[PDB]
Design a protein around this motif. Structure first.
Motif, PDB file in Angstrom:
ATOM      1  N   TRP A 147      -5.274  13.170  49.771  1.00 54.08           N
ATOM      2  CA  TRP A 147      -4.107  12.968  50.835  1.00 54.08           C
ATOM      3  C   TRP A 147      -3.666  11.710  50.813  1.00 54.08           C
ATOM      4  N   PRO A 148      -2.424  11.492  50.179  1.00 53.85           N
ATOM      5  CA  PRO A 148      -1.624  10.410  50.302  1.00 53.85           C
ATOM      6  C   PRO A 148      -1.050  10.125  51.498  1.00 53.85           C
ATOM      7  N   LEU A 149      -1.123   9.017  52.131  1.00 56.64           N
ATOM      8  CA  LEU A 149      -0.772   8.754  53.671  1.00 56.64           C
ATOM      9  C   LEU A 149       0.227   7.496  53.427  1.00 56.64           C
ATOM     10  N   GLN A 150       1.511   7.597  54.021  1.00 54.56           N
ATOM     11  CA  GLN A 150       2.314   6.616  54.206  1.00 54.56           C
ATOM     12  C   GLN A 150       3.102   6.823  55.530  1.00 54.56           C
ATOM     13  N   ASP A 151       3.880   7.743  55.584  1.00 59.32           N
ATOM     14  CA  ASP A 151       4.815   7.863  56.928  1.00 59.32           C
ATOM     15  C   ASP A 151       4.378   8.788  57.807  1.00 59.32           C
ATOM     16  N   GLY A 152       4.830   8.843  59.023  1.00 61.04           N
ATOM     17  CA  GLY A 152       4.326   9.742  59.978  1.00 61.04           C
ATOM     18  C   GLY A 152       3.417   9.278  60.993  1.00 61.04           C
ATOM     19  N   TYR A 153       3.180  10.356  61.974  1.00 60.09           N
ATOM     20  CA  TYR A 153       2.038  10.018  63.049  1.00 60.09           C
ATOM     21  C   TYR A 153       0.997  10.110  62.559  1.00 60.09           C
ATOM     22  N   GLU A 154      -0.144   9.262  62.748  1.00 59.98           N
ATOM     23  CA  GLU A 154      -1.531   9.233  62.117  1.00 59.98           C
ATOM     24  C   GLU A 154      -2.239  10.201  62.796  1.00 59.98           C
ATOM     25  N   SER A 155      -2.204  10.626  64.025  1.00 54.28           N
ATOM     26  CA  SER A 155      -3.205  11.226  64.867  1.00 54.28           C
ATOM     27  C   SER A 155      -3.058  12.723  64.341  1.00 54.28           C
ATOM     28  N   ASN A 156      -1.893  13.102  63.987  1.00 56.27           N
ATOM     29  CA  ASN A 156      -1.595  14.442  63.508  1.00 56.27           C
ATOM     30  C   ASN A 156      -2.122  14.542  61.867  1.00 56.27           C
ATOM     31  N   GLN A 157      -1.892  13.469  61.166  1.00 53.08           N
ATOM     32  CA  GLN A 157      -2.347  13.438  59.852  1.00 53.08           C
ATOM     33  C   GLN A 157      -3.933  13.493  59.730  1.00 53.08           C
TER      34      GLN A 157
END
Length: 174
Positions: A147-157
């Protein structure tokens, strides 16, 4: 058959994510019933603690929170080498590995560029024989589906990641 204590071993760089992202991930995993090891102990000494080697050996999988300064810690890198060793060798069950790239480029991890390259430049000849195995483990982990993570709401990620891990681990448990 080998002894199993945890579903997930959580590998992280404390200075980057101990108190924020990885803590939220840790508590989300437990809410899903995923038995997770997250080291919270004071540690001293160059060598990786035996308790950490044992936790990895007794985990069905590891989740790696790759972050900007992960490769600046020799303890994180020795940990990662142990995880990828188990990933290759551990059978019945395997040792699955789930990489999260928390605001880092997977390519930087894979090729040891950017901040990961800078880390390697910072080490000296004291540790020159560790560097080859460290590179191999970073490259192998970075080549795994994650999972590459940058933008968006962290709780749903985090919710999606832990739903995915839950399903992948339940299907293997059969």
């Amino acid at each position: 058959a080998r002894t199993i204590t945890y579903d997930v071993f959580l590998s992280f760089r404390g200075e980057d994510t101990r108190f924020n992202f990885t803590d939220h991930l840790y508590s989300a995993l437990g809410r899903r019933g995923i038995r997770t090891f997250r080291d919270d102990k004071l540690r001293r000494g160059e060598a990786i603690a035996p308790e950490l080697l044992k936790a990895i050996e007794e985990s069905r999988s590891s989740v790696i929170v790759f972050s900007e300064n992960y490769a600046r810690s020799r303890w994180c890198l020795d940990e990662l080498v142990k995880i990828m060793e188990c990933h290759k060798d551990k059978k019945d069950p395997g040792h699955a590995v789930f990489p999260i790239f928390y605001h880092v480029d997977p390519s930087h991890v894979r090729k040891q560029e950017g901040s990961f390259g800078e880390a390697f430049a910072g080490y000296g000849e004291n540790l020159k024989d560790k560097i080859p195995r460290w590179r191999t483990a970073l490259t192998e982990a970075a080549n795994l589906s994650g999972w590459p993570l940058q933008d968006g709401y962290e709780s749903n990620q985090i919710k999606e990641i832990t739903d995915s891990i839950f399903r992948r681990l339940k299907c293997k448990r059969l």
